[PDB]
Amino acid sequence: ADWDFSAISRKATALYGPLGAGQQRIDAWQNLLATQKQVSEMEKLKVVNLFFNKQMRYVEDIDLWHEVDYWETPIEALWKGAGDCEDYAIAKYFSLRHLGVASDKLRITYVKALRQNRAHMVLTYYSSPDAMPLVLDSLIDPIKPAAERTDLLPVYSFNAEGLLSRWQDVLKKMQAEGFPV
Amino acid sequence: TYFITMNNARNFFIQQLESNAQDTATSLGLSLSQSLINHDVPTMDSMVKAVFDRGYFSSIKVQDIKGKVIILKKQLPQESDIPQWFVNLIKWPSTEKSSLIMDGWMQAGVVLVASDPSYVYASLWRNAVEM
Amino acid sequence: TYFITMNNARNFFIQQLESNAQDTATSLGLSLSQSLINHDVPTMDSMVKAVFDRGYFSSIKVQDIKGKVIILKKQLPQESDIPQWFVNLIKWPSTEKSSLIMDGWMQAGVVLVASDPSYVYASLWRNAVEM
Ligand SMILES: [Ca+2]
Ligand SMILES: [Ca+2]
Numbered sequence: 001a002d003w004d005f006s007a008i009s010r011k012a013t014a015l016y017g018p019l020g021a022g023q024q025r026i027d028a029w030q031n032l033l034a035t036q037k038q039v040s041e042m043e044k045l046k047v048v049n050l051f052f053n054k055q056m057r058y059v060e061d062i063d064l065w066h067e068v069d070y071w072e073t074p075i076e077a078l079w080k081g082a083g084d085c086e087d088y089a090i091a092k093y094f095s096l097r098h099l100g101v102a103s104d105k106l107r108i109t110y111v112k113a114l115r116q117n118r119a120h121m122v123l124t125y126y127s128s129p130d131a132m133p134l135v136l137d138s139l140i141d142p143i144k145p146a147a148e149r150t151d152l153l154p155v156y157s158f159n160a161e162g163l164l165s166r167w168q169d170v171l172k173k174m175q176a177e178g179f180p181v
Numbered sequence: 182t183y184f185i186t187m188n189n190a191r192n193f194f195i196q197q198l199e200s201n202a203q204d205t206a207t208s209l210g211l212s213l214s215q216s217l218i219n220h221d222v223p224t225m226d227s228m229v230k231a232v233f234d235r236g237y238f239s240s241i242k243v244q245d246i247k248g249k250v251i252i253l254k255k256q257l258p259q260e261s262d263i264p265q266w267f268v269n270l271i272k273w274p275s276t277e278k279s280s281l282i283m284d285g286w287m288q289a290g291v292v293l294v295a296s297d298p299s300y301v302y303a304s305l306w307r308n309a310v311e312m
Numbered sequence: 313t314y315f316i317t318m319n320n321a322r323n324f325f326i327q328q329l330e331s332n333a334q335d336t337a338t339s340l341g342l343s344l345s346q347s348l349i350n351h352d353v354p355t356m357d358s359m360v361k362a363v364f365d366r367g368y369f370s371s372i373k374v375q376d377i378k379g380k381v382i383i384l385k386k387q388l389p390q391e392s393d394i395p396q397w398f399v400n401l402i403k404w405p406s407t408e409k410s411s412l413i414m415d416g417w418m419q420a421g422v423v424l425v426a427s428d429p430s431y432v433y434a435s436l437w438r439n440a441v442e443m
Contacts, residue, residue, distance in 0.1 A: 107412070110230060112221070112224050120227075130377050130418070130419065133417055156231040156341075156414065167234075183317070183401075183436075184317055185439045186315055193328070193435060197328045197332055197368070200367065201335050203366070205335055205338075208340055211343045212342045215346070300328075308316045308324075
């Protein structure tokens with residue numbers, strides 16, 4: 001399931017306009033995916049989590065998209081260089097899947113962020129089904145065992161799937177951007 | 182070839198949408214009971230988002246015992262592409278199913294779930310046969 | 313006086329049932345996630361039964377974190393007055409929709425909700441009109 005970044009850049013330019021500095025960030029993403037396939041799974045988690053936390057500024061959807069809730073594709077996140085809680089999680093999810101992390105190990109997790117006192121979303125990694133998960137977050141850079149994140153309270157978790165709803169709309173946008181399905 | 186009347190197709194969707202809206206309202210009402218007791222708006226907000234983002238509902242609403250709205254998730258208005266005269270032939274009063282949120286035997290509020298008929302309208306409109 | 317073809321009705325009805333199975337899986341999975349309810353088998357059994365009796369599913373299944381089947385509710389086995397030639401025109405496989413059962417951050421299992429295409433078979437057989 002290889003990704004054609006030249007065609008993706010061409011299609012995204014038509015969908016969103018000239019990508020500007022977003023093209024360089026998409027180039028940096030392509031480099032990450034090209035050079036991190038053979039490292040350990042724990043290293044994949046670190047470099048992907050750190051890459052998007054550094055490449056994206058946290059800005060609310062109402063400011064960036066003029067919509068209360070708007071789920072970015074990874075290309076949209078890198079085009080804008082910005083997003084909010086679920087945008088980080090989605091971008092890290094698809095990157096880790098492309099790098100070979102099994103889908104059974106990755107969950108989209110709705111949480112309560114205690115310090116911000118608001119609904120929040122993170123990506124969780126389960127080394128085995130009964131394991132304590134690691135939290136890939138947009139609020140901080142370290143990846144910690146979930147129970148060590150005393151500032152978070154989990155609400156519900158989802159295994160990402162699909163082929164209209166929020167996640168399906170993301171997949172629809174990625175198909176238009178040129179990603180294989 | 183075999184057909185079914187438009188009215189019979191309509192009846193199936195009314196049954197299935199009301200059942201689905203009621204089932205989510207009841208099961209979500211159970212899940213919301215402790216965060217509502219605790220007045221934990223972010224957790225209630227997070228639960229409704231989890232169900233709403235994954236489903237196809239028009240709206241989910243959480244009220245307290247006095248009817249004051251605590252959580253409201255709504256679908257942005259949708260464009261269609263389906264004439265109103267046809268919708269008038271098949272439309273049914275707006276579906277909204279409720280379930281009480283309980284603190285033991287004491288009623289603590291209500292959750293209200295409304296289905297989204299836009300799939301029903303589109304399926305019947307695209308494949309309607311006049312005979 | 314509008315009709316829809318039986319083949320198109322079959323597609324709509326199956327899609328609506330499969331969507332309902334997903335929504336029920338999500339809401340039931342969330343409710344079983346609360347207060348370690350999924351470890352209280354008598355309470356979880358009562359909860360799954362309530363959802364099954366009100367729904368139209370072929371089966372609801374609960375597995376724990378090790379994959380052991382803990383709850384399995386299935387349609388009581390009733391025989392069909394529907395001829396095979398008619399079923400062959402409309403037959404479709406039953407899909408199983410899932411949602412996770414959680415204890416906070418720890419995974420506790422999965423709830424599996426299966427659609428029932430035989431319900432569509434019976435509805436179309438009752439309302440089939442030949443033209
Ligand atoms: Ca958002
Ligand atoms: Ca967003």
